[PDB]
Structures are given as C-alpha cells and as structure tokens.
Design an enzyme around this catalytic site. Structure first.
Site, PDB file in Angstrom:
ATOM      1  N   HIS A 109       0.796  -1.205   0.000  1.00 13.42           N
ATOM      2  CA  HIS A 109       0.000   0.000   0.000  1.00 13.42           C
ATOM      3  C   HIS A 109       0.848   1.285   0.000  1.00 13.42           C
ATOM      4  CE1 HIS A 109      -3.768  -2.299   1.788  1.00 13.42           C
ATOM      5  NE2 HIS A 109      -3.590  -2.542   0.498  1.00 13.42           N
ATOM      6  N   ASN A 166      -7.047   0.413   3.469  1.00 11.89           N
ATOM      7  CA  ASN A 166      -6.615   0.044   2.128  1.00 11.89           C
ATOM      8  C   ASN A 166      -6.970   1.219   1.242  1.00 11.89           C
ATOM      9  OD1 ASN A 166      -8.445  -2.113   3.507  1.00 11.89           O
ATOM     10  ND2 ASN A 166      -6.832  -3.398   2.571  1.00 11.89           N
TER      11      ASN A 166
HETATM   12  C1  LIG Z   1      -1.087  -7.663  -4.419  1.00  8.40           C
HETATM   13  C2  LIG Z   1      -2.267  -7.269  -3.639  1.00  8.40           C
HETATM   14  C3  LIG Z   1      -2.682  -5.947  -3.751  1.00  8.40           C
HETATM   15  C4  LIG Z   1      -3.765  -5.532  -2.992  1.00  8.40           C
HETATM   16  C5  LIG Z   1      -4.354  -6.435  -2.113  1.00  8.40           C
HETATM   17  C6  LIG Z   1      -3.687  -7.644  -1.758  1.00  8.40           C
HETATM   18  C7  LIG Z   1      -2.714  -8.112  -2.636  1.00  8.40           C
HETATM   19  C8  LIG Z   1      -2.016  -9.441  -2.351  1.00  8.40           C
HETATM   20  N1  LIG Z   1      -5.424  -6.032  -1.382  1.00  8.40           N
HETATM   21  C9  LIG Z   1      -5.951  -4.856  -1.537  1.00  8.40           C
HETATM   22  C10 LIG Z   1      -7.290  -4.693  -0.992  1.00  8.40           C
HETATM   23  O1  LIG Z   1      -7.794  -5.364  -0.115  1.00  8.40           O
HETATM   24  N2  LIG Z   1      -7.435  -3.368  -1.031  1.00  8.40           N
HETATM   25  C11 LIG Z   1      -7.030  -2.344  -1.743  1.00  8.40           C
HETATM   26  O2  LIG Z   1      -7.437  -1.205  -1.561  1.00  8.40           O
HETATM   27  N3  LIG Z   1      -5.862  -2.613  -2.298  1.00  8.40           N
HETATM   28  C12 LIG Z   1      -5.285  -3.839  -2.183  1.00  8.40           C
HETATM   29  N4  LIG Z   1      -4.243  -4.203  -3.012  1.00  8.40           N
HETATM   30  C13 LIG Z   1      -3.578  -3.162  -3.795  1.00  8.40           C
HETATM   31  C14 LIG Z   1      -4.268  -2.750  -5.065  1.00  8.40           C
HETATM   32  O3  LIG Z   1      -4.355  -3.814  -5.937  1.00  8.40           O
HETATM   33  C15 LIG Z   1      -3.515  -1.600  -5.718  1.00  8.40           C
HETATM   34  O4  LIG Z   1      -3.628  -0.551  -4.812  1.00  8.40           O
HETATM   35  C16 LIG Z   1      -4.197  -1.125  -6.954  1.00  8.40           C
HETATM   36  O5  LIG Z   1      -4.252  -2.219  -7.821  1.00  8.40           O
HETATM   37  C17 LIG Z   1      -3.372   0.023  -7.553  1.00  8.40           C
HETATM   38  O6  LIG Z   1      -3.959   0.400  -8.764  1.00  8.40           O
HETATM   39  P1  LIG Z   1      -3.133   1.153  -9.926  1.00  8.40           P
HETATM   40  O7  LIG Z   1      -4.147   1.148 -11.046  1.00  8.40           O
HETATM   41  O8  LIG Z   1      -2.643   2.492  -9.411  1.00  8.40           O
HETATM   42  O9  LIG Z   1      -1.753   0.311 -10.114  1.00  8.40           O
HETATM   43  P2  LIG Z   1      -1.533  -1.195 -10.517  1.00  8.40           P
HETATM   44  O10 LIG Z   1      -2.728  -2.032 -10.139  1.00  8.40           O
HETATM   45  O11 LIG Z   1      -0.252  -1.504  -9.806  1.00  8.40           O
HETATM   46  O12 LIG Z   1      -1.381  -1.182 -12.107  1.00  8.40           O
HETATM   47  C18 LIG Z   1      -0.456  -0.291 -12.722  1.00  8.40           C
HETATM   48  C19 LIG Z   1       0.046  -0.789 -14.065  1.00  8.40           C
HETATM   49  O13 LIG Z   1       0.889   0.018 -14.934  1.00  8.40           O
HETATM   50  C20 LIG Z   1       1.722  -0.935 -15.524  1.00  8.40           C
HETATM   51  N5  LIG Z   1       3.005  -0.361 -15.786  1.00  8.40           N
HETATM   52  C21 LIG Z   1       3.915  -0.216 -14.839  1.00  8.40           C
HETATM   53  N6  LIG Z   1       4.923   0.422 -15.455  1.00  8.40           N
HETATM   54  C22 LIG Z   1       4.580   0.705 -16.723  1.00  8.40           C
HETATM   55  C23 LIG Z   1       5.203   1.332 -17.796  1.00  8.40           C
HETATM   56  N7  LIG Z   1       6.410   1.874 -17.753  1.00  8.40           N
HETATM   57  N8  LIG Z   1       4.509   1.370 -18.970  1.00  8.40           N
HETATM   58  C24 LIG Z   1       3.284   0.874 -19.136  1.00  8.40           C
HETATM   59  N9  LIG Z   1       2.691   0.302 -18.096  1.00  8.40           N
HETATM   60  C25 LIG Z   1       3.308   0.255 -16.922  1.00  8.40           C
HETATM   61  C26 LIG Z   1       1.507  -2.304 -14.986  1.00  8.40           C
HETATM   62  O14 LIG Z   1       1.844  -3.395 -15.694  1.00  8.40           O
HETATM   63  C27 LIG Z   1       0.253  -2.244 -14.287  1.00  8.40           C
HETATM   64  O15 LIG Z   1      -0.690  -3.213 -14.599  1.00  8.40           O
END
Ligand SMILES: *Cc1cc2c(cc1C)nc1c(=O)[nH]c(=O)nc-1n2C[C@H](O)[C@H](O)[C@H](O)COP(=O)(O)OP(=O)(O)OC[C@H]1O[C@@H](n2cnc3c(N)ncnc32)[C@H](O)[C@@H]1O
Ligand SMILES: *Cc1cc2c(cc1C)nc1c(=O)[nH]c(=O)nc-1n2C[C@H](O)[C@H](O)[C@H](O)COP(=O)(O)OP(=O)(O)OC[C@H]1O[C@@H](n2cnc3c(N)ncnc32)[C@H](O)[C@@H]1O
Lengths: 577, 577, 104, 52
Positions: A506, A551
């Site tokens: 987080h 969260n």
């Molecule tokens: C892993 C996990 C996360 C989680 C959770 C329990 C687990 C084991 N439980 C949560 C829950 O109960 N509550 C909640 O509020 N959050 C919880 N999480 C976290 C949650 O999944 C994340 O907070 C959320 O998914 C974040 O969303 P966001 O849309 O900001 O980011 P992301 O999901 O990490 O996706 C970002 C993406 O961008 C891509 N990427 C990264 N770098 C690049 C570049 N350079 N170019 C193009 N794309 C890029 C990724 O691949 C990605 O998919």
C-alpha cells in the site's frame, strides 16, 4: 495503432480504468498502454480468483499472487555457503549477482515492496477490501469548510463504490462470519463497532463470489464495438512507456515515448491529455526518466528544478498478523439451539430444533444449516457446514484505535501441520497501521544500475518514523493480541508477527497531492495535475499525502474521478469523424 | 448451445487438441468441453510462460505451476499439534478434514500426483520436452513386423513433431549449453551420445522462446470463422463432463452427460463419436462413473463386467534430481581463447582473441560473446554473458542406461542461499526411470468419498515394483551422481534425492492399449477404441501400456493421430449448412 | 529478554500417569503412559488470559524477536509435573497417597 | 546442549510421519510399527509430550 489520441493513459490497473471509464464514456479518443499482457481470460483485466477452480481451492491462489509479484529492490546477498564442493567455482566476494541492487542499503529497505506487470495490474489478484478513509486519514479537498470537504468526499466515494461494486452483504449468511462478528460486537459493546469488511464483489451463488477488478470498472474491450458504437478506445499491451517529453518551458507535455516489447519498435505518441497510472513506484520511475526530480542518490546541496518533493515523504503501512484456532466455547455456541439424542452414526441419532422459539439464540436459516450438517455428516465432529463461507469482519479505524483491521481469511500457504487443523476453525488477523510522512523517507533511482526493463533501478531509503508511528504500531500489535484472544488461541507457527516491510503493498506518497507545491511539499494539485503542467495527470496511491491505515485504492479511485472532472472541463474531445 | 455434433471431445489438453485438429480439418462438426476455464490470454490454451515478464523472471514461474496443480489423493493428516491454547477447539481424533481421502493408505500412495483444470490442460505450464520412445519403451502397433512397426511409428512421430513444433536447435548458440554438451560428449565418448533435449518450442529472438502448447496444435477458436469459413468447432469451458451413457448391449455410447458449472444446468449432448481426453486419472474416473470397471475397493472375487483391466497396471516414473554449481575448470575454459592483459575497470584492460585461429578451443560466435561480456562488464567475475540461455542437454534412454535425462534449467524456487549462488553457475539434473506395469498397482475410486466436483474420489494402491524397476532406479541415482560430478559439485540443499512419487506427473497405463483385451490385459485397441464399443475413444498417457522413461506426451499424441485415422475412415461428417 | 509465564492447572481425577503391563522402558521397567488434557474451565481460561498478559506486559520493554513470538510450549516441557503421589490429610476424603508427614 | 543431553522423553507415541522419497531399493514396512523406543500405549493427543 495510429499515434494521435485525445487522451493517453499509462497503465491498465483500476486507476487507469477509472480514467478510461470516465473519458471513454464522455467521448474522448483514448489509448491505454500496459507493459504487461492480457492473461486473466476473455474478460480483460478481470480477477484471477473468479474461476470455479479457485472458488473451490482458495489456498492455491497464494501461488498466483506470488507468481506476479516482482520485488522492487533486493540488496546484494551476503549469505555464506561454505559446503560447496572444492571443484565448484566460487567468487572471493559477494558480487552483484542475480538482479540484486548494489545501491540498496539492506537496513533501510522496503524489502517486501513488489510490483505486478499484467493487464489489470494488482486488481487481478487483490483482496478487494474498499473502506473509506475517515477525516484523520484523508487528504483535504476543500480548505476551511469541513462539511464541504465531507460532501465532496461522500460524492466521490459513492461513485467509486459503484464502479467497484462495493457492498457489505456478500457474507451475511455465513455462520463463521456471524459467530466472529457477534462475539466481537458483544465483547466491545459501547466501545467499538464491527461490520462486514466493505468488499468490491458480487455474490452469484452460495458457493461463488465474483470478485471485482479493473475489468469491473472498465471492460477494456476496444471501441467502437457493437455495445458502444460511438466510443473510441484502444488498449495496447506489452508496451513500455518510457518517458514523457516536456517542452522547454516546462508547461506542457508534447509526447509519450513508447517501446513495443513484442515488435521492438519505438514510437512517439501524441495526445492532448497524458495520464500516468503505472503504480506508485513506476509513475515516479517514468517521471524521473523524463527529467522530473533527479536521478541518482539525492543531495540537498543540489535540489532538482522540477518537483523537488517527488519520491520523498513515502509512506508504507505497518502490518501485524496472526491466525487463531476458534475457541471451544464459540464452536459449542453454534449448536446451542440443538437437541441431540442418541449417538452419532447409529440407528436413530437425532438432531432437532424448534423454529421460531425465542429461547433460540440463533436464526432459523442458521439452525437449519447446522441441523442438516450434523444429521448428514454424522462422522464429522464440528457443527459448521463444510461449505460455510469465511468471516469477513472489520472494526474500522478510529482515533482511539488508529489502525485498520481485517478478521477474515484470504489466500494463504499452510505448513503441513497447519494443514493439520480443520480450516473451519481458522481465522486470519491483519491489522494495518498508519505511517507518518517524512521527508527523509525516499524512493530514488540509480544513475548506474538498471532494472529488468532497462530503466533506472529503484532504491529505497526508508525507516518507520520515530514517534507516533512507531508507538502506534506497537499499540496495534498488542490490540491484535488482546482482540484475537476473544475468538481463540494462536495457531502455532502463525503467532503474532510484524510482516516484512512493504509486503502490504500500500505504498503511498511518492508523488503526493497538496494545495501548494512549496508549502505542502507536493507534486500534484487536488485535480491530480502536475504543478506547472497543463496536460499531465498522475493517479494512484502515490498521490495520497496523509498517514493512512485503511486500504487506499478506493481513495485513489475517488481522486481520479475528481481528476476526470477537471479534464472534462478543460479539454474538448475530437469530433467522432 | 445446441445438442447434436459429429464428434465430442472431453478435455482441451494437447491430446484433445490433436483430435480437434484432425477432425475439424477433415470437416467434422466438433464440440469440445473442458471443466476448466480460459485464462492464458487471447491465444486460447497457450503456454503461460510466453509472457515477456516470465521470459525475464523465469523462476517466478514455479508459482504458476503450483497454483494450477491440485493433489489427486491426500491421506488423512496425523501431524500432532500440541501447543494450541487450551481454549482452542481440538478434536480427539484425526478425523477426515480439509479434503483428505480416508480411503488412501499413506504408504501406498502417489502423493505427488496432481491434476490441472484449465483450457489447454497441463500444456499451459509444461516443460516442452518431446522425445520419441525407442523400441524398448514403445507399444507395438504392428504385430510380427518390426520394420513395419518402426515405419509406422516414424510416420506418426513426424506428424506429432510438426503439430508441437518440436526441434533440437533453439539453444544451439548458448554458451552454457555447449559448455555442458561438449564436456559430457568428451567424457562419454564412444559410450553415449548427447544432444539437445527435443523441445516443442520456437525461438523468436535471442531473449524470447515461444514454448508450444495445446494452442500450437489447435488454436481453439470457434469455427466457422474468417480464417476457416468451412470448419465447425465449438469450445465449451467450465463444463464438467460427468458420464458417458452406455446402451444396454454395451456396444455404443448414446450421449454425454454434462454439467455447466456457471449456469448449474445439466444437459445430454449427442454425437456419433465420443473421445475422452481428460487425462490419465480423469478419463478413468469418468469411465468408472459411467459403469465401466468398478466402483470401490477392488476385489478379485468380483471382477467387473466391463474393462476389468481399467485402472490396473498403472505406471509412474521414478525421478531423481539434484542441482550443481559449475566447476572452476569449466568456467575457466569458457575464456581459454582469450588474451587478458591490464587490469579490470581501468584503461589498461584488454580482452582479445583471434577470430578463426585454429588453435582456438571455441568458435568465433562464442568468443565474441565472451569478449564483449568481459570488456563491457569489467566488474563481473564470470566470463558467461548475463543473457546466455540455459543448457538443454540430454542423453536419451538406451538399454545400457535405461533412463531419460534432462540436464538443463526449468522453473525452480531458490532458498535464500541458492539465491546466493550466481544463476549462470547452476544446472538442474533430472533422470527418469521406467516402471514395470503390475496388476496390483491400481487407481480406483471410492464408493463413499467424493472429490471437489462431487465425483468418486480417486485412490491409489501403488508401490514401485520389486526387481528390475527398483534395481534400475537406484542405478539411475548412481549414474546421476557420477555424471553430474563431471560438470561441478552439488548445490547445498539440492543434493541428489528421489522426488515425491507422481510429482513427475507422467502417470500411464490407467486405460492401457493392446491388441487383445484379455490376452494383453487392456482397455483400448491400437486405434484407441474402447473394446466392444463402436464409437468411444480414449487418448492420452493412460493408453501407454509399456514401462517408459522418456516424457510421454509425444507418444500419446502419435497414438491420437492413428486414432483419428480410424475415425476418418469409419465415420462420415455431417453436411455443412 | 526472555519472557516465561507459568499457569496453574486444576487437579482432575481423569488426568493420569499409568504404566503398561506389556511395554517396558529402557531400564526394562513398566512403560509410563500419560492420559492428560488441560482441564476445561478456570485452568483453560487462565492459560489464555496469561498469554494476553505476556503480550501486554512484554510490549512495555520492546517488540517480539522474530521467530520467538508469543507461543505455548510443548505440554510438559516445563517439567514441574505434580500430583502423581499427592499429599492430603485423609486418603479417601482428600483423594491422596501420603499424609502431611509425606508418609504413605 | 547440556540440558538437552540429559533429558529423556518419558512417553513418545508411535511415529506416523510419511517418508515417501526413499529409494525403491530401500527396505520399507507397510505399517507404522513400534520402532525406536516409541510407546504404542500412548494416545498422541492425550500426551505430555515434553515431559522428560
Ligand atoms: C497484491 C495485492 C494488492 C492488494 C491487495 C492484496 C494483494 C495481495 N489487497 C488490496 C485490498 O484489499 N485493497 C485495496 O485497496 N488494495 C489492495 N491491493 C492493492 C491494489 O491492488 C492496488 O492498490 C491497486 O491495484 C493500484 O492500482 P493502480 O491502477 O494504481 O496500479 P496497478 O494495479 O499496480 O497497475 C499499474 C500498471 O501500470 C503498468 N506499468 C507499470 N509500469 C509501466 C510502464 N512503464 N509502462 C506501461 N505500463 C506500466 C503495470 O503493468 C500495471 O498493470
Ligand atoms: C505439470 C507439467 C506437466 C509436464 C511437464 C512439467 C510440468 C510441471 N513436463 C512435460 C514435458 O516436459 N514433456 C511431456 O511430455 N510432458 C510433460 N508434462 C505433462 C504433460 O503436460 C501432459 O502429459 C499432457 O498435458 C497430457 O495431455 P492431455 O491432453 O492428455 O491431458 P491434460 O493436459 O491433463 O488435459 C486434460 C483436460 O481435461 C480436463 N478435464 C478433466 N476432467 C474433466 C471432466 N470431467 N470434464 C471435462 N474436462 C475435464 C481438464 O481441465 C484438462 O484441461
């Protein structure tokens, strides 16, 4: 694939999907790039645990999680292996090996911090818990009008809750849920409230819950299509976005530089609006790579010209954990309304109850389930039906207990001797504490070392702040031990412990929001727009400036909704030619 | 969802896809049902490790494998946990808990046997090794004519190799590969031949290998479609096939009973031809559930009416394993052609060779790689390039060494000190023994206990046979110890060991082939047709009646090709409209 | 710092040490066998109260050392076995084996 | 180590741990027989296993 869009979004997690949902629906020509690929089936970006095989076999889902979590910064390994054969090759030093990061001080790390590169991001595996922040945890959207700030936050959260399909009813008829909830409710009467964890999920049947994800927010299908013939959207997976190109005046982004990983081709993509939603670590990466902040080990004797606060004041929640094995007391309570003549197994063992009786401690949906279980599985020594859903209980953050709580089950790898214990007895406890934002707590990017995608290697410089943060984390541990004891004793090998820093995931504050760049030490304003730039927005937990225990995704999603309102008011979509 | 097809196939693994490829291409109207779901991206049934993220982070892939392997038969757990709190509920006995099978003798199990339920089956995660069997391991297809038998096998194997895209050239310019190949070649010269493992894979770039799968054999897209306008194919995922309905004469199957796991509905599907390709365990379970063989603990006082050999003569390979750390002698030899003067990290450092010199031990492509690595990364103590592919070495099964060998790297979870050793140094050793088929080695199904899909619970009664099998298993262990020592010493924590029985997952002989049902103690003939039935065919490793050491999928595909030949000559496709 | 909290266990007739009439130990004497569970009621309730108390008290000095968090120890590892030949004033009334002079 | 060296367990139940990675040539019983000083009288669930 052309190279002019109205809006480009980097990243396809649920924050990116928030922007797509709002701007596609409002008529903008949108392109979204993700460095990862489509791999959750035909509903693009959907929750991987929504297959019948994981609804039947949830403990195997921990492997799926582990399989898509890649550590952000691993220090150089210095373990001594001195039982190698003398014929085997061995170095004389602990050299830079195996992807490790020689910039990382192992003692100032967030060793558990990890990132996921898949379409849908982390919402393909998350636990779906979506609480609101109370005032103490929550950034201000209006100054000096606490009731106006509240109305604004209520409006955005209600919207965010509808996109996620958040609800507090999916577990209402679970016997284990109600057993735990009622016991805690009673033990803390007049002191704390308990309820079901708010969960982004929709129950489809007694044995199936459809967990929400990015796909729930926006289905990620290319448009125009039959169901949306006037919308314009393209998703481009396996594309690394490497940097945004600033103009000389630092007032505008002029393009996005991408790298198609399958074809190898590079392009400069033009849009009117640029939105970065690559996660808290990768938003900051892309920004440093684009000339915001500075590359290399920071030094206050040379502060960066652009966004001096970027990658400071980073916050990660403290997390304490244990598991309990349900008390004999609570298991006996389950069958409290049952009359049990005869001996199990044999001829006319009988189990009955009187519906409606108001000596009955339990409702009749409960008693019917317990009766049918005990009558049909006479050899089983517990009164809880085999397919009873898990508990999903919370008491939310409050000033007298400033931590978030989840009292539940999720994906977990049991030792062969916690596989010894009947799963129906087992409750997981996870308490999450808030971390004060401190300038000295940093994420920075090596100017020499590069990651698996050849981008500057992220390095942490982090310690949980002294003072309130540290004392609260220790109060939170104690509160878990006290609370848990009301439900049962610790499961051996899963006693109370702090979890590896960052394993919670987080991470916040890397590119934090505030009213004024200088005075609030921030990178974006309350519209999520980067200071000085007309057309660049950032979304995600990196925006959250406050110390929070709950969260954070629903809060981040709410801030993205507000961002899209500014966009809609300041940029005109291209005519659908 | 209509109800009449030319052909229905149960299972979408590589064998079911073999049948689809042949029969869809021959103009039959084909339905395929899988209890699992589509979840490998938009290429249905494709290899999960073909994402760029797994090509970069191969060792996270062990998680994906584990997440989709569900143990077949888990005995009742008798681990004593005696440090529970006194308030915690505790049973007085080791009752049937957590999906355990009280029928299973823990000392006669294949504890490692596991099944995968997803579209494409185990081919979404497999290692892609596809050797042919030599005569010793191979079922006879022609009786009393070894040249015709050979000719027939060669024709079938050749076609299966094209379907899977098998080759022996994808690692030809790996330094690590050739280092180990050349050394083992030299050491066993005049005694054994070494080559690359034949792999069902296509190299796409120096850093990307496209591993084959069910998708490679048949793309699994519904037809008719734009690329195949005259073909007819439908895939139905999340459908449990539960029973084939026998006619009273036991000469014909009359329908397939299905259960749609999403809607909950049950249907009967009609076809002219019924093909079961549900894996070795699940093909047998469906047949037993349809009234073939018998339900319950087997009893030779009451041999069943149909297919009395079903689920007897089962075979699993013994597997020995270790890992090694490469010898100082071999590492030093990588750079034997180089001239190194000056000192690393400074101006003075020069690494050079003489392209073409005849005294060079290595070819120029190797020397260039080594020189570039050493010159460009002067701080790294190893002469192997960071991105050099892994070894992929075999000496194939022979009568003087009757085991199959893999000398390579696949997905593996390094403990925190195996993470200590540079991965360029590490080689995995897997040797596979052949197991003699014995009537007492059985897979049977409980008449009382049921599995997670409410089907009769599989139970094993297995011990490695005494005599030759046992003797060869131990000789095979010795031989791995001796051969591995030529490359380097063992990696601590990964010394030579037998792997959990069945963890190999090459289970065979559960529905075995031969020429005569009684004489050859078998269930299907050489066309894979169930004895006595006109229209029921079985495909997969369950058909293989021999003791084999080599990986079986290619042999099983070859058998399916033959079966398709018989179907094509005896069943007429319906007219297309 | 090590923390060890020791609770009290109510004497119950059903809690026994007995000696096999077939199995013999290493000195060829009748093999000891236990028939024991922590009594329900106060003993069990106090044991859990005692765990909590250690958790609360220990936090005033510092946090847990990883790997040595709060746990119950293997029953009997304490080695303060009592009551096997118990003292009382009257054999029948106090269910005992020795008097207050420790005389049988 | 000194303490552990002079403490002998009073009552050890019959061991039921499954070891199934033995070589096929190695001798294996077909039951969990009374072995290594274990007490077949001892119910492992009603024991004082740390008593010594
Ligand atoms: C892993 C996990 C996360 C989680 C959770 C329990 C687990 C084991 N439980 C949560 C829950 O109960 N509550 C909640 O509020 N959050 C919880 N999480 C976290 C949650 O999944 C994340 O907070 C959320 O998914 C974040 O969303 P966001 O849309 O900001 O980011 P992301 O999901 O990490 O996706 C970002 C993406 O961008 C891509 N990427 C990264 N770098 C690049 C570049 N350079 N170019 C193009 N794309 C890029 C990724 O691949 C990605 O998919
Ligand atoms: C696990 C794996 C497998 C493996 C390997 C290494 C690993 C970790 N290495 C291999 C290798 O290098 N070479 C080789 O030849 N094989 C190796 N394997 C094994 C290989 O993947 C299997 O031999 C092969 O996949 C067998 O194919 P088949 O098509 O016969 O069976 P399957 O892949 O198991 O798919 C069967 C499916 O049917 C379904 N199913 C099961 N029950 C039902 C019912 N009742 N109804 C409908 N469908 C059903 C499954 O869901 C499955 O997809």
């Amino acid at each position: 694939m052309d190279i002019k869009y109205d809006v480009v979004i980097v990243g396809s997690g649920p924050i990116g999907c928030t922007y797509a949902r709002e701007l596609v629906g409002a008529g903008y020509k949108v392109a979204m790039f993700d460095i990862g690929e489509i791999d959750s089936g035909l509903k693009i970006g959907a929750h991987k645990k929504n297959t019948v095989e994981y609804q039947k076999n949830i403990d195997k889902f921990v492997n799926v999680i582990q399989g898509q979590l890649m550590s952000v910064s691993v220090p150089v390994n210095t373990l001594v292996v001195d039982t190698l054969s003398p014929t085997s090759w061995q170095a004389s030093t602990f050299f830079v090996r195996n992807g490790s990061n020689p910039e990382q001080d192992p003692l100032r790390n967030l060793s558990g911090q990890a990132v996921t590169r898949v379409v849908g991001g982390m919402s393909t595996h998350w636990t779906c818990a979506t609480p609101r922040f109370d005032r103490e945890q929550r950034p201000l959207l209006v100054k000096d009008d606490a009731d106006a700030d509240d109305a604004e936050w209520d409006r955005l959260y209600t919207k965010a809750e509808s996109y996620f399909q958040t609800g507090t009813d999916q577990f209402k008829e679970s016997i284990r849920h109600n057993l735990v909830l009622n016991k805690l409710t009673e033990e803390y009467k007049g002191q704390r409230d308990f309820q079901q964890i708010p969960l982004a999920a929709t129950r489809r049947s007694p044995t199936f819950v459809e967990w929400s994800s990015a796909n729930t927010v926006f289905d990620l299908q290319n448009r125009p299509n039959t169901d949306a013939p006037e919308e314009r959207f393209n998703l481009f997976p396996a594309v690394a976005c490497e940097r945004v190109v600033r103009n000389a005046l630092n007032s505008e982004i002029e393009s996005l530089h991408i790298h198609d990983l399958i074809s190898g081709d590079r392009f400069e993509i033009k849009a009117d609006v640029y939105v970065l939603t690559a996660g808290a670590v990768h938003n900051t990466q892309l920004l440093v790579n684009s000339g915001f902040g500075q590359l290399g080990r920071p030094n206050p004797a040379n502060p960066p010209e652009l966004l001096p606060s970027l990658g400071s004041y980073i916050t990660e929640q403290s997390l304490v954990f244990c598991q309990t094995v349900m008390s004999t007391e609570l298991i006996d309570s389950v069958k409290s309304d049952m009359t049990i003549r005869g001996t199990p197994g044999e001829l006319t063992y009988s189990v009955t109850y009187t519906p409606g009786a108001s000596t009955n401690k339990h409702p009749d949906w409960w008693n019917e389930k317990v009766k049918n279980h005990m009558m049909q599985h006479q050899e089983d020594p517990l009164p809880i039906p085999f397919e009873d859903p898990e508990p999903q209980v919370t008491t939310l953050f409050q000033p007298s207990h400033p931590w978030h709580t989840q009292i539940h089950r999720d994906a977990f790898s049991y030792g062969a001797v916690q596989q010894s214990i009947d799963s129906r007895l087992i409750v997981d406890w996870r308490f999450f504490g808030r971390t004060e934002p401190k300038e000295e707590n940093k994420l920075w990017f090596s100017d020499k070392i590069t990651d698996a995608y050849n981008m500057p290697q992220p390095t942490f410089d982090f310690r949980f702040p002294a003072g309130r943060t540290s004392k609260e984390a220790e109060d939170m541990m104690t509160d878990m031990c006290v609370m848990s004891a009301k439900i049962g004793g610790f499961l051996p090998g899963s006693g109370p412990q702090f979890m590896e820093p960052g394993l919670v995931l987080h991470l916040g504050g890397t590119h934090r929001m505030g009213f004024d760049e200088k005075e609030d030490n921030c990178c974006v304003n309350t519209d999520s727009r980067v200071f000085g730039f007309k057309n660049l927005f950032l979304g995600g937990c990196g925006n959250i400036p406050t110390a929070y225990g709950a969260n954070p995704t629903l809060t981040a999603m709410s801030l993205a909704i507000k961002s899209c309102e500014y966009i809609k008011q300041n940029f005109t979509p291209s005519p659908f030619t």
